[PDB]
Protein backbone atom coordinates (compact mmCIF):
# COMPACT_ATOMS: atom_id res chain seq x y z
CA UNK A 1 0.00 0.00 0.00
CA UNK A 2 1.27 3.44 -1.04
CA UNK A 3 -1.30 5.87 0.36
CA UNK A 4 0.44 9.01 -0.82
CA UNK A 5 -2.66 11.19 -1.52
CA UNK A 6 -2.25 14.66 0.01
CA UNK A 7 -3.74 18.18 -0.25
CA UNK A 8 -1.71 21.39 -0.02
CA UNK A 9 -2.62 23.47 3.06
CA UNK A 10 -0.09 26.26 2.36
CA UNK A 11 -0.89 29.61 3.97
CA UNK A 12 -2.96 28.30 6.91
CA UNK A 13 -1.82 29.42 10.37
CA UNK A 14 -3.48 28.60 13.74
CA UNK A 15 -6.19 31.18 13.10
CA UNK A 16 -6.96 29.78 9.63
CA UNK A 17 -7.91 26.16 10.35
CA UNK A 18 -10.84 25.88 7.91
CA UNK A 19 -13.07 23.23 6.31
CA UNK A 20 -10.23 22.53 3.87
CA UNK A 21 -7.86 21.77 6.76
CA UNK A 22 -10.45 19.34 8.16
CA UNK A 23 -10.72 17.66 4.76
CA UNK A 24 -6.93 17.46 4.38
CA UNK A 25 -6.59 15.96 7.86
CA UNK A 26 -9.36 13.46 7.09
CA UNK A 27 -7.65 12.38 3.83
CA UNK A 28 -4.10 12.15 5.19
CA UNK A 29 -4.87 10.57 8.60
CA UNK A 30 -8.45 9.44 9.36
CA UNK A 31 -9.42 7.77 6.13
CA UNK A 32 -5.93 6.38 5.65
CA UNK A 33 -6.40 4.52 8.94
CA UNK A 34 -9.81 3.37 7.75
CA UNK A 35 -8.37 2.21 4.40
CA UNK A 36 -5.92 0.03 6.32
CA UNK A 37 -8.69 -1.27 8.57
CA UNK A 38 -10.80 -2.17 5.55
CA UNK A 39 -7.93 -4.14 4.02
CA UNK A 40 -7.44 -5.94 7.33
CA UNK A 41 -11.12 -6.76 7.42
CA UNK A 42 -10.97 -8.45 4.03
CA UNK A 43 -7.77 -10.39 4.76
CA UNK A 44 -9.07 -11.55 8.14
CA UNK A 45 -12.48 -12.49 6.74
CA UNK A 46 -10.83 -14.78 4.17
CA UNK A 47 -7.94 -16.05 6.35
CA UNK A 48 -4.95 -14.89 4.25
CA UNK A 49 -2.77 -14.81 7.36
CA UNK A 50 0.49 -15.63 5.61
CA UNK A 51 0.25 -12.55 3.35
CA UNK A 52 0.62 -9.45 5.52
CA UNK A 53 0.92 -6.40 3.28
CA UNK A 54 3.75 -3.90 3.56
CA UNK A 55 2.46 -0.38 4.16
CA UNK A 56 4.84 2.24 2.88
CA UNK A 57 3.68 4.94 5.23
CA UNK A 58 4.41 8.53 4.08
CA UNK A 59 5.82 10.40 7.08
CA UNK A 60 7.27 13.93 7.01
CA UNK A 61 10.24 15.61 8.75
CA UNK A 62 8.03 18.70 9.09
CA UNK A 63 6.81 18.76 12.70
CA UNK A 64 5.66 22.38 12.30
CA UNK A 65 9.13 23.65 11.33
CA UNK A 66 8.08 24.99 7.92
CA UNK A 67 5.00 26.73 9.38
CA UNK A 68 1.66 27.98 7.94
CA UNK A 69 0.71 24.50 6.68
CA UNK A 70 -2.62 23.85 8.45
CA UNK A 71 -3.06 20.39 9.99
CA UNK A 72 -0.40 18.78 7.75
CA UNK A 73 2.17 18.28 10.52
CA UNK A 74 -0.47 16.91 12.89
CA UNK A 75 -1.66 14.42 10.26
CA UNK A 76 1.88 13.22 9.58
CA UNK A 77 2.73 12.93 13.29
CA UNK A 78 -0.56 11.13 13.88
CA UNK A 79 0.48 8.46 11.40
CA UNK A 80 3.62 7.74 13.46
CA UNK A 81 1.38 6.19 16.12
CA UNK A 82 0.80 3.19 13.86
CA UNK A 83 4.32 2.01 14.72
CA UNK A 84 3.18 1.34 18.28
CA UNK A 85 -0.27 0.12 17.23
CA UNK A 86 1.31 -2.64 15.11
CA UNK A 87 2.65 -4.20 18.33
CA UNK A 88 -0.28 -3.34 20.59
CA UNK A 89 -3.18 -4.50 18.32
CA UNK A 90 -4.24 -7.72 16.56
CA UNK A 91 -3.59 -6.80 12.90
CA UNK A 92 0.16 -7.41 12.60
CA UNK A 93 -0.73 -10.73 10.97
CA UNK A 94 -2.31 -8.84 8.07
CA UNK A 95 -0.10 -5.73 7.79
CA UNK A 96 3.50 -4.59 8.38
CA UNK A 97 4.67 -0.99 8.57
CA UNK A 98 7.48 0.81 6.75
Amino acid sequence: IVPFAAISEQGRQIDGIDSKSELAHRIMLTNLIRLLGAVKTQKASRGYETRPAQVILPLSPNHGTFGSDGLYSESKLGLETLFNRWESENWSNYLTIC
Binding site: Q54, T65, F66, G67, L82, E87
Partner: peptide, 23 residues
Protein backbone atom coordinates in the same frame (compact mmCIF):
# COMPACT_ATOMS: atom_id res chain seq x y z
CA UNK B 1 12.47 -7.07 7.83
CA UNK B 2 9.04 -5.42 8.10
CA UNK B 3 7.62 -8.81 9.05
CA UNK B 4 10.01 -8.80 12.00
CA UNK B 5 9.34 -5.26 13.21
CA UNK B 6 8.07 -1.90 11.87
CA UNK B 7 10.75 -0.12 9.85
CA UNK B 8 11.36 3.63 10.03
CA UNK B 9 13.26 4.87 6.96
CA UNK B 10 14.77 8.35 7.26
CA UNK B 11 14.93 9.66 3.67
CA UNK B 12 15.20 13.29 4.82
CA UNK B 13 18.69 14.01 3.47
CA UNK B 14 19.75 15.67 6.73
CA UNK B 15 17.26 18.57 6.84
CA UNK B 16 16.68 17.81 10.54
CA UNK B 17 20.20 19.07 11.30
CA UNK B 18 19.46 22.62 10.02
CA UNK B 19 18.29 24.91 12.86
CA UNK B 20 15.57 27.48 12.00
CA UNK B 21 14.85 26.17 8.49
CA UNK B 22 12.02 28.69 7.88
CA UNK B 23 14.20 31.72 8.73
Amino acid sequence: LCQNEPVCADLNGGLQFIPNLNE
